[PDB]
Symmetry: C3
Subunit: 318 residues, 3 copies
């Protein structure tokens, strides 16, 4: 929402009665991708259901689901069984923040959000490890204390069943329970400096052989926005990752224009090097069109890995 143009918007209230509400939201987002003059339909629908029940003025319960649905006809009127259950959680919140269990966001998304401002492109050099991103078996916390926003998460290792040598098997055939070692945590903080338009952010995450930190800053004036983000860590034992993003935005009437630069290195070789620009027209707050171009600055990476991309989108938010 807002400057994070690709993010979900709040849904429509379909039931409300007695501090209890049901909001149905999501989107129908038509997306045409053009690479080497060849089209791919990257359209997606999301459907989401957010229930909130006020328990008292200090406390509320929440439930949330979101699914994403796509097609891949390849030229036939095919049956398309493409579903991703993006979110499945319940939680409790109040004046001291909100805590959930189930698949939900970890702490670093609101840091990557400093530079993730484009309708389609961008966010290519800010890889989030699972516990920092969105993942199940996870306790997720968010709170806002004046000008300070904090998020945190803690993921449990997933239970599995193993034989007497440690091979993973069906429970019926197992000798004992073990786990996959995929416990982890994430933490972030954002400080908004009053009404100045200046925000800073930082965070960290760790999960088995993966770890990272992030630093960001942004400055918002009346119709202009600037931001930078830095990520550094390991994606595996002896696989370094470092990424940098810059973002700029300008708003003119109902239109928003953005540009980003994204550069990442994986194992000390460049893995992303993108300059992208876009334009997004808001007819209404829930109906928009956009056009975006990614200059892919990798070159002879493979031919396919170095191709530029044009994207054209029409987005309706439920």
């Amino acid at each position: 929402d807002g400057i994070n143009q690709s993010g979900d918007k709040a849904g429509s209230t379909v039931y409300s009665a007695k501090g209890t509400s049901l909001e149905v939201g999501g989107r129908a987002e038509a997306r045409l991708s053009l690479k080497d003059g060849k089209a791919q339909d990257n359209s997606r629908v999301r459907l989401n259901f957010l229930g909130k029940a006020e328990i008292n003025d200090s406390l509320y319960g929440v439930g949330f689901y979101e699914g994403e649905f796509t097609t891949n006809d390849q030229g036939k009127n095919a049956s398309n069984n493409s579903l991703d259950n993006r979110y499945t959680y319940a939680g409790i919140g109040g004046t001291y923040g909100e805590v959930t269990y189930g698949k939900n966001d970890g702490a670093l998304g609101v840091i990557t959000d400093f530079t993730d401002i484009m309708s389609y492109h961008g966010n290519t050099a800010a890889e989030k490890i699972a516990v920092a991103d969105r993942v199940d078996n996870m306790l997720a916390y968010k709170g806002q204390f004046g000008d300070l926003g904090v998020k945190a998460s803690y993921r449990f290792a997933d239970r599995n069943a193993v034989d007497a040598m440690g091979n993973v098997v069906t429970e019926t055939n197992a000798a004992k329970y073990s786990d996959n070692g995929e416990d982890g945590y994430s933490l972030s903080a954002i400080y908004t400096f009053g009404d100045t338009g200046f925000n800073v952010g930082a965070g960290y995450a760790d999960q088995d052989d993966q770890n990272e930190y992030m630093l960001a800053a942004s400055y918002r004036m009346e119709n202009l926005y600037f931001a930078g983000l830095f990520t550094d860590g390991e994606l595996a034992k002896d696989v370094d990752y470092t990424g940098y993003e810059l973002a700029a935005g300008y708003k003119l009437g109902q239109a928003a224009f953005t540009a980003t630069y994204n550069n990442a290195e994986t194992a000390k070789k460049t893995s992303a090097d993108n300059f992208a620009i876009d334009a997004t027209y808001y007819f209404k707050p829930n109906f928009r069109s956009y056009i975006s171009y990614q200059f892919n600055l990798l070159d002879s990476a493979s031919k396919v890995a170095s191709e530029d991309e044009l994207a054209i989108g029409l987005r309706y938010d439920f």
Copy 2:
């Protein structure tokens, strides 16, 4: 909707404010199929979500999703992951019609609608190629100007990633992008002769090695409906297709009765020859029952025993 009894009904408005509306629709449709005395559960649920944002009095935006959900227990309380994302589109519309991108109908369904009036059977001799039917990677247009309805669609070929010999592979193993050559288009027009009861329609489509035209006409007056449909084309290199449908319908009170004859030939051999009849009772606009029988006129001189079998269907349909 309406005379196209198997089609969706408009949904229920659940939200309407600030120039935005949300309609939730779909169906829960219980369907027992009996062939050679043997029962198959053909029940299906649809759920759909239609969003409309009024921009000004001659402009609006739309978003639409429809999913179909079924079971196939085969005698066990099974876990059933059966989903078909039937429609996923967004569009912009207004005085000059509506255009969408994403999986949506092409132009010929409104032509097949002339004879596709039964609750379960019919529509067996009017095959639509993908771009004419419903398919993704497609821009789809529809407009109604007085008594003239027009539709058009254009589908792009799908990009793929290939190796040095053109075999489709993952993007990491690929030498280059290519495409599948599945571009195409469709077009149609329907003229409704105001209150006379007469309608005429035609259309055309073309996609890769397939093409077809359709012609149709109908008469509706005072609870009676008659129609005919002709389709002719090619479904592949060296595979002609010609189909004929006739339809008649009668509405009495809350009941609707229909009959269709459908005859198709594929590569100059009869591939469908069906006479079907049905009765549908509308308890309420969104709750109905029906019974239907298809007399399959194919026989052992032209088709296998299974391909030649008749079908009884019994349904109960609730529309959300």
Copy 3:
């Protein structure tokens, strides 16, 4: 679902006009399972849609869908295509009860509901064969006539297409239609004894080489509840199954406390032996938390005998 805590609650009316209504229901149910100190995310969402069209005072139609959605990331932000279409039916009801076709409950769940009162655990020694449980290609009936509740179902065998030697093949290759022999039926009765707080229940089912009956009784009085359930039958040719279950419940304010003993024997070997206890707190009718512990008394693999702690938070849509 009242005392049957793990069951669905009625949904929220999003549309209502002229005796036609649409309810959107379901849950978002966060569930952490801990065994031998190791955690599993058993969280689930349900989404459901119930349409009802009053036709007259004594007649209505219904349509229902429910899906269940889960994740299994295993430590990655995975794409999760996990969907179970639990219910897909339409029906007609009124004075003489309600009849449906499409995937819906058979007759025995209202009997297992005598002791299936826990938030998470319980219902481990009351196996229901498909026709008695929930399955498609089935006609389902329910009706209440004063203090007598009845349910019944009949399942057709599923048609298939076979070659000339009986092997299942695709229709285009087939010689004839056949079926898989999965026809079956179920029946059950519950009698409420007037104003006494006592109910008794019985039912039975049969489907191919599986059959069973169940007997149950319950007492409900003044924030307390007790019940028993017995199940006996066959899960396959020469494969016996016997189960029993005891349950107790106590309600104090917004809190409900339950305990169950469940013991089942499959082919004359103990296959479930569980004592569970829990506590559920209803903050609001549609938001609850719970905690539950299952003492697994089997000691036969180490894994098969492990206890479980569950913690839940449940939002009902």
